[model samples]
Target: LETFPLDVLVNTAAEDLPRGVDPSRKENHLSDEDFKAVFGMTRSAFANLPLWKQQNLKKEKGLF
Candidate 1:
């Protein structure tokens, strides 16, 4: 499975995992470390994504 969707879902779920033990709160912003923990991802497993795909995955268009 692709890490981007896994990461996005994991990060989304992390928000509801209760506050105190949630590591995602440490960064004040989402980071690989946070998603990795929730998704049990390895460095190389997560690194398989190309830079372009990663960039595109992170891109958002504002909806007015």
Candidate 2:
């Protein structure tokens, strides 16, 4: 099927990243909810997270 409005919205919701963030910082400093929204989990779960997930976040946030 062709991409619908819903698909576009979903893509934006899923793929979108925020602006005005500084990549020089170590942590993204996203307050709890915002962090979860981007990474799909909490900060506590982050260290245990795999490299790809971390890399993806970095790439979008200009960390890499």
Candidate 3:
């Protein structure tokens, strides 16, 4: 049931993430149609990731 906010994925560059942990390879470049085409999902769908994808994202945000 755990997950990250949608912004965490949208605003991040996959290259900056750990090699095996990244979910997308778009390199932080794209438009709305390109967004779904690259990731095969819309903004909201990204928030509902597979269990392990959800797990990896939860601990990334350090700001409180």
Specify the highest-TM-score model's number.
Answer: 2
Clash pairs detected, candidate 2 = none
lDDT of model number 3:
0.46
lDDT string, candidate 3, 1-64, tens digits? 2233345445556565434333542213335665455456675676568756644543453211
Candidate 3 matches the true fold with a TM-score of 0.31
In model 1, how large is the Cα lDDT of residue 58?
38
**Against the unseen true structure, what C-alpha lDDT does each candidate score?**
0.39, 0.47, 0.46
Residue-level lDDT of model 1, residues 1-64, one tens digit each, is 2223333433445445434332422222334665555435654653477755444433431100
Stretches of candidate 1 off by over 4 Å are 1-43, 61-64
Q: Give the CA lDDT, 0 to 100, for residue 36 in model 2.
A: 60
Candidate 1 clash total?
0
Candidate ordering by TM-score (highest first): 2, 3, 1
Off by over 4 Å in 2: 1-28, 50-53, 61-64
The Cα error of candidate 1 at residue 55, in Å, is 0.6
